[PDB]
Amino acid sequence: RIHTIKINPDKIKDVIGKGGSVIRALTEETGTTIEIEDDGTVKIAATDGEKAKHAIRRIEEITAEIEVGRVYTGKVTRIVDFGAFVAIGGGKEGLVHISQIADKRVEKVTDYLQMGQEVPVKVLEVDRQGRIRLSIKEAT
Amino acid sequence: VDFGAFVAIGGGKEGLVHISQIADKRVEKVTDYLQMGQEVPVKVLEVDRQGRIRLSIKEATEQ
Amino acid sequence: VDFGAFVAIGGGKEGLVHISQIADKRVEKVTDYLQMGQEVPVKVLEVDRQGRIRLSI
Amino acid sequence: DPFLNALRRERVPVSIYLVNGIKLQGQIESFDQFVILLKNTVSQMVYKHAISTVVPSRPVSHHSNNA
Amino acid sequence: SLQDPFLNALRRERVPVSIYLVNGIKLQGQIESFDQFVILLKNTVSQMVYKHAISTVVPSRPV
Amino acid sequence: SLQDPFLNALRRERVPVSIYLVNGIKLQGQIESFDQFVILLKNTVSQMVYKHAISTVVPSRPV
Amino acid sequence: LQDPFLNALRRERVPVSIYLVNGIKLQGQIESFDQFVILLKNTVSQMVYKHAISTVVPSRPV
Amino acid sequence: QDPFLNALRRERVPVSIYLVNGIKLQGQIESFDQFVILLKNTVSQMVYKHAISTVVPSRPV
Amino acid sequence: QDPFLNALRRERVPVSIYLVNGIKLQGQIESFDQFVILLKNTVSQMVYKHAISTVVPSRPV
RNA sequence: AGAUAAGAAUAAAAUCAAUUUAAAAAAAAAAAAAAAAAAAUUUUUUUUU
Numbered sequence: 134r135i136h137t138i139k140i141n142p143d144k145i146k147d148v149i150g151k152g153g154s155v156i157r158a159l160t161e162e163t164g165t166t167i168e169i170e171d172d173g174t175v176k177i178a179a180t181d182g183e184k185a186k187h188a189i190r191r192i193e194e195i196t197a198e199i200e201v202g203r204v205y206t207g208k209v210t211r212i213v214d215f216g217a218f219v220a221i222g223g224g225k226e227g228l229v230h231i232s233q234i235a236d237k238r239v240e241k242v243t244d245y246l247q248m249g250q251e252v253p254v255k256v257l258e259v260d261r262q263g264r265i266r267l268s269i270k271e272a273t
Numbered sequence: 274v275d276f277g278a279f280v281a282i283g284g285g286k287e288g289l290v291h292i293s294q295i296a297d298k299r300v301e302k303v304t305d306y307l308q309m310g311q312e313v314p315v316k317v318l319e320v321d322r323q324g325r326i327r328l329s330i331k332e333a334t335e336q
Numbered sequence: 337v338d339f340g341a342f343v344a345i346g347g348g349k350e351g352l353v354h355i356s357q358i359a360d361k362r363v364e365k366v367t368d369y370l371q372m373g374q375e376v377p378v379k380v381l382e383v384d385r386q387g388r389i390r391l392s393i
Numbered sequence: 394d395p396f397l398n399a400l401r402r403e404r405v406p407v408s409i410y411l412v413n414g415i416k417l418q419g420q421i422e423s424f425d426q427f428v429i430l431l432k433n434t435v436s437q438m439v440y441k442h443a444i445s446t447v448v449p450s451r452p453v454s455h456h457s458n459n460a
Numbered sequence: 461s462l463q464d465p466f467l468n469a470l471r472r473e474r475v476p477v478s479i480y481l482v483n484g485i486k487l488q489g490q491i492e493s494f495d496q497f498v499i500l501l502k503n504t505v506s507q508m509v510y511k512h513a514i515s516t517v518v519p520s521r522p523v
Numbered sequence: 524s525l526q527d528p529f530l531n532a533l534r535r536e537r538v539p540v541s542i543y544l545v546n547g548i549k550l551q552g553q554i555e556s557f558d559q560f561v562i563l564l565k566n567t568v569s570q571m572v573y574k575h576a577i578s579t580v581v582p583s584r585p586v
Numbered sequence: 587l588q589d590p591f592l593n594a595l596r597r598e599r600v601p602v603s604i605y606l607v608n609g610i611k612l613q614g615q616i617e618s619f620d621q622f623v624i625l626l627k628n629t630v631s632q633m634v635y636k637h638a639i640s641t642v643v644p645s646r647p648v
Numbered sequence: 649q650d651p652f653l654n655a656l657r658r659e660r661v662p663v664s665i666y667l668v669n670g671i672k673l674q675g676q677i678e679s680f681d682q683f684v685i686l687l688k689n690t691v692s693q694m695v696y697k698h699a700i701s702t703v704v705p706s707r708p709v
Numbered sequence: 710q711d712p713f714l715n716a717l718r719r720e721r722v723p724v725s726i727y728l729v730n731g732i733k734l735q736g737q738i739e740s741f742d743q744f745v746i747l748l749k750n751t752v753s754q755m756v757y758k759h760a761i762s763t764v765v766p767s768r769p770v
Numbered sequence: 771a772g773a774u775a776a777g778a779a780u781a782a783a784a785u786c787a788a789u790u791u792a793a794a795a796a797a798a799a800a801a802a803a804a805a806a807a808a809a810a811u812u813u814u815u816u817u818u819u
Contacts, residue, residue, distance in 0.1 A: 146324065146792055153793035171792080172286075216785075230785045239783045257785090261771075264786055276771065292434070292771095301434050323791045356455075356799050364800075384723065384735050386751070386797060394806095396747065396755065410788075411515055412760050413484050414730050415773055425462035426806085427511075435518055438466060442816065443482050443515035445728050445760035450789080452798055453753055460740040460801040481578050483547050484773035495525045497819040503775090505585045508529070512819055513545050513578040515773080526819075541776095544640050546609050548779045560636075560818040561588035568643055571591060574819050576607050576640040578776070588818070606701055608670045609780050620649040622817040629781095630704050633652055636818040638668055638701035641779080664782095667762050669729050671784050683743060683805090683817075684710050693765040694710060696758060697817050699729065702782090711804045718802075731784045743805050744816065751789060752798080759816030762784090 134185045136177040140196045145171055147263070148195060155195075155224065163188040194223045200256070204270060207254040212246040219254055219269070227254055227267035234269055275303055280315045280328045289326035294318055296330055305330070338366040343378050343389060353378075353389040360392055368393070395456065397424045406450045411443050463511070467494040469523045476520040477501070481513050530557045532586050537565070539583045544576050591648070592619045600648050604634060605641040613645075653680040655709045660688070665695060666702040714741045716770035721749075723767040728760050 148169045149156050160167050165188045166178035175192060179185035200221055207221040217234070218226040231242065245252075258266035278295065279287035292303040297318075299305060306313050316331040340352040355364045378391050400407065401421055409417045409431075419433030430438050470477055470491040479487050479501070489503035499509040533540060533554040542550045542562075552570060556563030562577065564570040595602060596616045604612045604624070614628030624634040656663055657677040665673040665687070675689025685695050717724060718738040726734040726748065734756075736748035746756040 149792040428463045437518040447755040498526045508580040558587040571642040633703040
């Protein structure tokens, strides 16, 4: 197959990554060859249909899909006082320090430390810089 | 476009230029001509952030 | 050169030490460091930093 | 301050940060002990009591004297 | 004292300005009086915009 | 300083004003005592307010 | 003026609610006063800077 | 009022230092000046008195 | 405090600068005044002292 | 590419990557002065405009 998607130009730097690390990771995790035109559209050079579908799923999980809006149920993943790294999607950790988690009455992170625990989360910091950060609804 | 323009010296592909280095800060507007399809020739200025492209209004190998 | 010297501690490349390091005093002229091949003290002594040397006479 | 006058003399493009963390890109055009004027795209005045830090994009020539 | 004459020139021309506060809030209007620590600016009525609370000023037109 | 007379005019007309603090708070009251560093309110809650913390003022009625 | 008003509060030993520029609230009683500092005998002795204060209000009329 | 900082330094009292941003630090005075305070706890550091909102001790002095 | 700052500048000590905001900066003193710092970084940088909350050195002066 | 035209008030609880962006990448000591300024001992000085 040489499958193709006419996907949005602006996400380019995030589909390549610094050092090409995330494109290298994508190609190796899908076991499939990829072109993502700097100006133009993605091409997927695949041996067979299921491997092409696997590549589509992974690049769709990092193209568009902006996480700005209402509460989403993110998986806590790593939990520490300096932050829960709560991920709503792949390659998107909502690093949420105790200062984001809590104000007034405050408590040791053991009170809610878990990995993969789905919990309610929405935007609290935003920029062009890709340092956009979400927070647990306890921030209210 | 007001927030940066695509200008081709030649070929179908259209290269980028921005409000300052289009016209070496002679104006606040992106283009002194401020007109699409306008005849003023274009060539590259050296400055190149890896995430930026520069194609200034330049004739006769001004450099 | 007048502006500074390239000084070898090992095999991995080492850039120009600026004449303002090489010479403490106001003058900063090549006469202070014109001798080729001379063995000299050299400590970068620098972390979280780009490649530089604090050699000083 | 002579440092700010030297920047004005060399007309170096600088990144200024505010106390709130807002980042302004522009070339400083005038300065008093209360304020800077920078005329990047339109004439703008910034108060020094609201500035946190300033860093130049190009290198800036050493004062070459005792502080 | 660069600020005082610039503010007087804005007051003389009664040019619309955008003032920003230290907290990042915008206000809009015309300067029509000032003093060493305060500005009186009209959008509904001429009113106090304290200079120590101002972060930035940018006019609609050159003055 | 023309700021003190403006505050005295509000006090003379006993005008209820909305005072905005730099932290992004509206307070409400009537202008009462006034010093180079601080302003008091003659409202039922007798507030004393630091002018370094005052951002902007708007009245109930033009002064 | 602020300095005499502060002395009057100290003279009448009035409990006040102090507000800080950060949006801090506190309640306390006066220990002493200074051109740059406010000292409170409520709980442990607190040295509160005038540059940090936004607003002061009494609990009882001064 | 003025020797309050000296009294804390004399009693070497661990004192809660509050910055305008709402951050709390902990430690004792090493030396103090009209514009700046140098702290004794852990590594010695300078905190601008201008940046300090309030100070409250672990014991009264 | 003035000599401590001169000693940091003399010894080219790496210091952590904290502003009123939660930013952390690494540098060394290039020059200092009661209103400003000039700081060694990737480039020479200006800091207004009214923006600084605290400075803490990596090594004592 | 713009920062809420102000949350009646955070007993007080440091946010990730401040040179950017696609496979790095370009790379850079001349420094004591002990307060800045004015009155002529004071004051303001980024400890209340």
